[PDB]
Structure prediction request, 457 residues.
Amino acid sequence: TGWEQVLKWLNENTSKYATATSWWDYGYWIESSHARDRDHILALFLARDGNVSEVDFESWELNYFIIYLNDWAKFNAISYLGGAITRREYNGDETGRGQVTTILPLQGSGGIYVNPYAGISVRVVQSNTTSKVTVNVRGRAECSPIYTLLIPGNKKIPGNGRCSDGSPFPYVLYLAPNFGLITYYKVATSNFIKLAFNIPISKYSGFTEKLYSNFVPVYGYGNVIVYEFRPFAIYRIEELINGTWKAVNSLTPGKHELKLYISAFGRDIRNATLYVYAIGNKTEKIKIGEIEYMNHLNEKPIIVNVTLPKAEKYRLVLVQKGPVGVLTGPPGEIANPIRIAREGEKGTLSLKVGVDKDYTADLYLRATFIYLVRKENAAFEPHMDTFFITKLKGGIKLHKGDNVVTAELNMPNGVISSYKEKLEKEYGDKLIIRGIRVEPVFIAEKEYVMAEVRASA
Ligand SMILES: [Ca+2]
Prediction:
C-alpha cells in the first residue's frame, strides 16, 4: 500500500509541527495509529489545471502534499468536487444515462495495453504508413480517442473522438512504456495526473514546469508520493553567457548574472527579500535581491547579479510575511479551533502554539469562506476567499516549541454576515456555502525555500 512506510518517514525526517494533507482515504487507519469544506478546495487542486487550480495552500500553512495513485479510483468523486464535471457524469440519473470514468489505468508493455476489469484493450500500430491508436471495448465496439499522447516520446496521435457505433468517445489516452491511462477529456490535464503518474501535460503554457517546482518529491514508497510544498519556488535558472541566456544546471563560484524564473503558487509576493545560502564548510547567506510585488497569476522572470562563495551546494530562499505556527492546544473560551468565535463574542482566548524557529509574530483573526457557484447537469466552481478580520497582539516572541499568550479581542458582528450576503447579492441560487472558518493565525517574516542548485568547476 505505502501509507505506513510513508508515515514512518515524515516522523523522523520532517519537523515536529509540519502540517501535511492528502485526499481522504481509509489509509487513515494507520494515519491515526480532514474537513468536508476543504475537500472542495483540495479537489479544486487535484482535478483542475492552470490558474484555476492554483489554491492558496500557504493559508493552511501546508508543508507536505501526499498524493496516492490509487486515488484514481476516487477521481470521479474528486473531479465532481473540484468543479471539473457534472453530477450526471459522476453518477447520472437513475438506471442508465451517461456516467463517466474520469481515469482508467492500463497495464501493458509498449505498445499493447489492457485493463482486465473494464474489458478495455488498446492497440498501437505505430507503423508506416499507418500511425493509429485503436481501443477495443470488448463490447460495442471499437473506439477512437480524441488523441493519444506517447510518454516519453511526447508524440501526439490524433483520433476521431468517435465510436464504432458512431457514439461519442471523449477520452484522451496516455501511453507510457510500462503503463497506459484512459482519461476523460474534462480531466485530461489535471494536476493529479501530473503528480501521480508523472504525466507532464498541461493545457496552459509553462504551467507544468512551474507546478513541478512548487511540488518537489522528497519521498515515495508504494503508490504513495510525498511532495514538499513550496508556494514560491524557482523553476528555471539561466545565466548570461556570451550575450546569450543559457540554462543553468550547476552554479560555479564567482560572478553570475542569473535569470530567475519564479513560480508563485496560490498567492502573490508581497515585499520580499531574496537570499542565497552557500552550503559548504559553513552556512553563509548572501542577500541577492528583493521583490516589491509579483502577481501569482502572471509571474515574470527576475534578473539578479551575484557573487558566489565556494560551497558544496546553494539554497535560494525568499523571505516575507506568512502564517507561522500550529495549534498544539485544545485551545475559559475553549471551543472549536476552526471557528473559535461567532460574531459578537467576548472573553479571553487561551491558546498554545508550536513553532520550529524563533519568530517575532503578530496575531490576527482570519476569515476563510469556502463556497460553490453553479456554472451549469449541474457543475459547481469551488471558491476559497481569505481576509483578516482583526488584529490581537504583537509583536510576540515565539521560541522553538510551545508558547502561550493571553489573546483577547472581540469579533465584530457585521463582518462575516455582511460578507455572507455580499456573495449572495453577487451569485444566486448558484451559491452553496460549504465552510465558514474563523481562526487565529500568526504572521511573521517567514523563510520560504525556492530552489537548491549544486556546484561545480
Ligand atoms: Ca502561479
